[PDB]
Design a protein around this ligand. Sequence first.
Ligand code: HEM
Ligand SMILES: CC(C)c1nc(CN(C)C(=O)N[C@H](C(=O)N[C@@H](Cc2ccccc2)C[C@H](O)[C@@H](N)Cc2ccccc2)C(C)C)cs1
Length: 449
Amino acid sequence: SHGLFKKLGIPGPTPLPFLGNILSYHKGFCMFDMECHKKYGKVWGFYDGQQPVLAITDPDMIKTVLVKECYSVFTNRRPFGPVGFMKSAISIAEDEEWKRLRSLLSPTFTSGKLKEMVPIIAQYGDVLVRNLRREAETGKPVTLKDVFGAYSMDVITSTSFGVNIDSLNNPQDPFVENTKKLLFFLSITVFPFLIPILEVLNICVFPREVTNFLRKSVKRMKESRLEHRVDFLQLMIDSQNALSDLELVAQSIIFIFAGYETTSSVLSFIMYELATHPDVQQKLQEEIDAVLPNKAPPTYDTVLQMEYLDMVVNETLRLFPIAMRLERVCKKDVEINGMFIPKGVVVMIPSYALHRDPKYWTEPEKFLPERFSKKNKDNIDPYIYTPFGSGPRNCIGMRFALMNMKLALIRVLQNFSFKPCKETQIPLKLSLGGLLQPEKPVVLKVESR
Ligand code: HEM
Ligand SMILES: CC(C)c1nc(CN(C)C(=O)N[C@H](C(=O)N[C@@H](Cc2ccccc2)C[C@H](O)[C@@H](N)Cc2ccccc2)C(C)C)cs1
């Protein structure tokens, strides 16, 4: 196994027996990939345990793996841990099973279902500013992930399920509290031969306590709808006239998690960039005041007209690409762009590394929204810039995410400016676990306009 890259003539860091390159992870995924990129160039190989990984950085090659040969060769992500009934979730599902779920869930986020959600998301936006207004009344430092996550949970559960769980007004919220706790891998990558063992043992990477709750909760929601609109929950209900009850719950838990956690983390990172770059925050507030005169309620069309808001969201996602790597399993021997790729190798695209690459971005360490204007919208390669992946298995929730984040942004900036305080960690630093998160929570002061 460990001589494979040697044999192909692919450079990379020498593997230890059994562990592979796992120890290099002490400094985090991001740095490992950044160093390997500097040291080895456009292509390199390394071993997660005994699992060979081929990192690629050449735009043409990326397109081929993410786009042209998605269905034939590069359809699936790496098999994932002991997972239970969560095996059925779209992100983990494989080949035909993946295709039919993708096709079933693809309509959840069409243009028109987005537009029809703006009314709903906007009622939560007002509750969000109402919450932040009270906290601004005291001058108390705000941990934005709490306030953003409560908002994110309300939005996803009401857009997807038709239920107002009222997370914003409820400090003890079971949904938030459970959904976060659903979060070892070191031991297993050194030993993947264990995962199939842990089916028998029916243990999981999330507590039974959390999946119990969510199963119950979504079941209640289904039955509620059975005893109106067309959402994510109807789509799955309609298919059941070929989805099973467990499959339905599986997709629910993915959407619930992603709608809650990804949106809230990115929103906190944006606010951090706006707090530390007052001029960018000022200029964003001027665009929003000019598109929405006199604090006017956001609409679908008006969100599309905010060119600077889009540049700020994109630039934050360049610096903070919460996936950090994209992956696909090579499912049969193939040669693409002059290079041979054997079957069962993981092909990996190091987005975080590429987002910071001086060949592609001038001053890539700096928050510079203007790199995303129509002036430069063309100097930016879509295979280098991948905050949401690319091709047929890109992030299905991408437009939901952008719209939801933008609406939260318009509302909050229409009412407040954000500033650092004694509690903000300046130079923000990143946690060194396998999740793109701040070392400390983003805390900022909130002031009324
Ligand atoms: C800013 C927020 C988000 C970011 C940056 C993000 C990013 C990603 C990325 C990088 C991937 C891998 C795509 C690829 O491999 O090419 C992905 C996949 C996925 N995302 Fe997101 N995502 C976000 C929000 C969401 C939301 C809100 C949802 C659900 C409503 C969602 C649902 C999914 C699903 C179901 C997949 C797997 C799709 C499939 O396997 O067919 N994401 N996302
Ligand atoms: C950082 C990256 C290298 C990885 N993270 C993981 C584990 N996690 C935490 C994960 O969400 N995994 C995936 C999943 O289904 N990710 C969901 C949600 C979810 C997973 C497990 C349980 C509950 C919800 C996340 C979300 O759908 C995207 N919108 C966010 C995303 C995508 C790719 C990589 C990183 C983040 C799956 C690839 C195992 C494995 S590899």
